Structures are given as structure tokens and as C-alpha cells.
Amino acid sequence: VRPLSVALGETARISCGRQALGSRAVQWYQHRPGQAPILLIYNNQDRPSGIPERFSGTPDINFGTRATLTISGVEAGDEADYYCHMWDSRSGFSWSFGGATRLTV
Amino acid sequence: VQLQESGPGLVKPSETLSVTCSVSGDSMNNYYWTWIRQSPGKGLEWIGYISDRESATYNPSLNSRVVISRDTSKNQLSLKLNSVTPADTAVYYCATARRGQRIYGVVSFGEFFYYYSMDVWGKGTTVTVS
Amino acid sequence: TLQCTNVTNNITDDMRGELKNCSFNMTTELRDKKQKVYSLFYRLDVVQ
Numbered sequence: 336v337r338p339l340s341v342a343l344g345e346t347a348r349i350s351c352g353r354q355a356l357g358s359r360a361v362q363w364y365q366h367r368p369g370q371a372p373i374l375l376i377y378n379n380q381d382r383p384s385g386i387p388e389r390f391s392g393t394p395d396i397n398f399g400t401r402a403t404l405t406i407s408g409v410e411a412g413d414e415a416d417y418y419c420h421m422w423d424s425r426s427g428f429s430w431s432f433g434g435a436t437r438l439t440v
Numbered sequence: 441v442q443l444q445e446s447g448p449g450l451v452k453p454s455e456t457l458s459v460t461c462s463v464s465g466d467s468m469n470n471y472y473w474t475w476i477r478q479s480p481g482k483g484l485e486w487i488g489y490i491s492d493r494e495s496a497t498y499n500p501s502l503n504s505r506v507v508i509s510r511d512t513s514k515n516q517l518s519l520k521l522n523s524v525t526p527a528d529t530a531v532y533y534c535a536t537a538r539r540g541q542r543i544y545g546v547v548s549f550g551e552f553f554y555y556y557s558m559d560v561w562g563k564g565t566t567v568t569v570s
Numbered sequence: 571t572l573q574c575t576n577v578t579n580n581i582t583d584d585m586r587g588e589l590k591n592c593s594f595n596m597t598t599e600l601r602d603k604k605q606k607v608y609s610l611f612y613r614l615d616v617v618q
């Protein structure tokens with residue numbers, strides 16, 4: 336777990352510590368305590384049906400750009416921990432789930 | 441296809457630990473079934489997945505002592521833990537994933553890798569060791 | 571003599587050594603002292 340304090344309204348950009356070493360296929364997860372985790376966006380931009388159309392990820396192009404996630408239009412109840420699942424060509428199978436990200440308003 | 445998990449929550453240490461998981465809604469023949477365990481004080485830890493050729497892969501940080509048998513008669517996915525340590529107290533999560541493919545070069549040479557995304561998740565069943 | 575290691579290993583493909591990551595000793599600056607350097611060599615230019 337890691338600390339990240341935000342407030343209502345202003346957009347928040349959150350990335351993950353693990354750095355890419357190739358072409359990445361990151362996916363983001365929402366672990367609200369108690370309830371089951373929900374997939375926000377896969378393939379760095381491809382959110383599934385149901386997730387609000389306001390969380391936008393960084394597209395993979397011009398290798399080097401950090402994999403950061405945008406949660407603009409944050410709400411009061413956003414007190415969960417996120418998860419950046421990094422898949423890259425070189426690093427191989429990504430068994431680990433990365434580091435969490437506590438949300439505070 | 442909300443999965444229902446029937447966990448006892450009370451297993452003696454160094455014994456057998458079995459947790460079942462229902463499927464609900466639709467059958468399970470073209471989907472990948474993963475199992476994720478989250479322990480207090482840390483995040484979730486992916487264990488493995490089973491599908492296709494029935495050759496389920498296991499995490500290299502679990503010593504492969506766990507097995508994931510996928511059943512079709514009763515449509516359940518149980519977990520068989522052997523030689524479990526008394527420090528395995530963690531809530532187990534039952535979820536499935538779809539296997540996409542990422543391509544960066546000529547796919548005839550083999551320039552592509554498979555990545556899995558957990559489309560659906562189960563509420564899970566909290567199980568400890570006593 | 572180079573202490574080559576596969577750049578990928580358990581990274582991708584069949585563990586092919588198309589590229590090797592070779593570290594060796596060389597005399598940088600002074601002819602007495604020799605520090606450990608490294609470079610990327612192709613499998614076509616290193617003989618075990």
C-alpha cells in the first residue's frame with residue numbers, strides 16, 4: 336500500500352511504480368474494501384462496459400511515456416486502493432499484482 | 441455470471457484446505473479461471489489459472505503445492521492446499537479472466553505476448569487457519 | 571574471456587541466445603588497474 340491524498344473535484348493522475356521495458360499492456364483494478372475488485376481499463380485504454388466513461392489511461396505509443404491513470408471527476412466515496420498490472424514484452428509473465436494506491440479525499 | 445464461493449473459514453494448520461466456487465448463469469468451457477488470495481497487511485497475490493488443455497499454471501512463490509481442479513459435473517472450482525502453514529490466513533477471491541494478445545512485431549517470428557484481464561470477480565470467502 | 575549471459579533468458583521466446591550480455595576485464599586509463607566493463611554481443615561473434 337502507498338499513500339495518496341486528494342480532494343473533491345480536481346482531477347487526479349496516478350501511476351504505478353513498475354516501469355515498462357517494452358510494449359506494455361497495463362490494466363487497472365479497483366479494490367474497494369469488502370466488495371469484489373472491478374476492472375477499470377485494460378490494454379491501457381480499453382475500459383469495459385459499465386465503468387464510467389471518465390477514467391482514461393495513457394495510450395501506448397512512442398515508447399517512454401509513463402503508465403499513468405486519470406480519475407478526473409473524483410467523487411467523495413473514492414476511498415479504495417487501485418492496482419496497476421503491468422504486462423510488457425521483455426519482463427515476461429507478470430505474476431505479481433504490483434503496489435496498491437490508497438485513495439483519500 | 442456472478443460466482444458463489446462456499447468457504448468454511450476454519451481449517452486446522454498443516455491439513456487440507458478446500459474452497460469451492462460456483463459458476464452461475466453460464467457454463468465454463470471457453471473461459472480462463474484464476475484464483476487470487478489477499479492477506480491482511482498486503483495486496484492480492486495471484487495464484488494461477490486453469491483452462492483449455494487443463495494444464496493450470498501456479499505461482500512460483502507458492503512452491504506449486506496448491507492444485508486447481510476444474511469440475512464440470514457440478515460446475516465448481518475448488519482449491520486443494522496441502523502442507524498449509526498457520527500463516528495462510530487470507531480472503532480468497534474467485535474470478536475469471538480472458539486471454540488477450542499483444543503484438544509488437546512480425547507475429548510469424550513470434551513477436552507477441554499473452555496478457556490476461558480479470559473481467560469478472562467474486563465477492564470471495566474469508567478463510568483462516570486455526 | 572567474456573562472462574556472457576543471455577539478455578533474455580526466461581524473458582521471451584525459447585530462451586534463444588540471439589544476444590549475449592558479456593562482461594570482461596579491461597585496463598581503463600592506467601595500465602595497472604583494470605576495471606570490469608560490459609557490452610552486448612551477438613551470438614554470431616562469441617565462441618564458447
Ligand SMILES: *[C@@H]1O[C@H](CO)[C@@H](O[C@@H]2O[C@H](CO)[C@@H](O[C@@H]3O[C@H](CO[C@H]4O[C@H](CO[C@H]5O[C@H](CO)[C@@H](O)[C@H](O)[C@@H]5O)[C@@H](O)[C@H](O[C@H]5O[C@H](CO)[C@@H](O)[C@H](O)[C@@H]5O)[C@@H]4O)[C@@H](O)[C@H](O[C@H]4O[C@H](CO)[C@@H](O)[C@H](O)[C@@H]4O[C@H]4O[C@H](CO)[C@@H](O)[C@H](O)[C@@H]4O[C@H]4O[C@H](CO)[C@@H](O)[C@H](O)[C@@H]4O)[C@@H]3O)[C@H](O)[C@H]2NC(C)=O)[C@H](O)[C@H]1NC(C)=O
Nearest residue numbers: 358360378379380393394395396397543544545546547548
Ligand atoms: C514485413 O512484413 C511483415 C508482414 O506483413 C510486417 O510484420 C508486421 O509488422 C507490423 C509493424 O510492426 C505489425 O503491426 C503490429 O500489429 C499489432 C496488432 O495489430 C492488429 O491487431 C490490432 C488489435 O486486434 C484486436 O482487436 C481487433 C478489433 O479491433 C480484433 O479483431 C482482434 O481479434 C484483436 O482482438 C488491430 O487493431 C490492428 O489493426 C491495425 O491494422 C490494420 C491493417 O491491418 C489497420 O487498418 C487498422 O486501422 C489498425 O491500424 C491489427 O489488426 C499492433 O497492435 C501493433 O501496433 C501497436 O503496438 C505498437 C508497439 O508500440 C504501438 O506503437 C502501436 O501504436 C500499437 O499500439 C496501439 O494498439 C495497441 C493494441 O490495441 C494498444 O494496446 C496501444 O495502447 C496502442 O493504442 C493506442 O495507439 C494506437 C495507434 O494508432 C491507437 O489506434 C489507439 O487508439 C491508442 O491510441 C503493430 O502495428 C504486424 O503485427 C506485423 N505482422 C503482420 C502479420 O502484419 C513487417 O512490419 C514488415 N516489415 C517491413 C520492414 O516491411
Ligand SMILES: *[C@@H]1O[C@H](CO)[C@@H](O[C@@H]2O[C@H](CO)[C@@H](O)[C@H](O)[C@H]2NC(C)=O)[C@H](O)[C@H]1NC(C)=O
Nearest residue numbers: 575576577578590591592593606607608609610
Ligand atoms: C547486462 O548485464 C549488466 C551487468 O553486468 C546489467 O547491468 C546491471 O543492470 C541492473 C539493472 O538495470 C542494475 O541494477 C545494475 O546496477 C547494473 N550493473 C552494472 C555493473 O551496470 C545490464 O543491465 C545488463 N543489460 C541487459 C540488456 O540485460
Ligand SMILES: *[C@@H]1O[C@H](CO)[C@@H](O[C@@H]2O[C@H](CO)[C@@H](O)[C@H](O)[C@H]2NC(C)=O)[C@H](O)[C@H]1NC(C)=O
Nearest residue numbers: 571572573574592593594595596604605606607
Ligand atoms: C576480472 O578480474 C577479477 C579480479 O580482478 C575477477 O574476480 C576474481 O575472480 C576470482 C575467481 O577465482 C576470485 O578468486 C577473486 O577473488 C576475484 N576477485 C575479485 C572479485 O576482486 C573476475 O572474475 C574477472 N572477470 C573476468 C575475467 O571476466
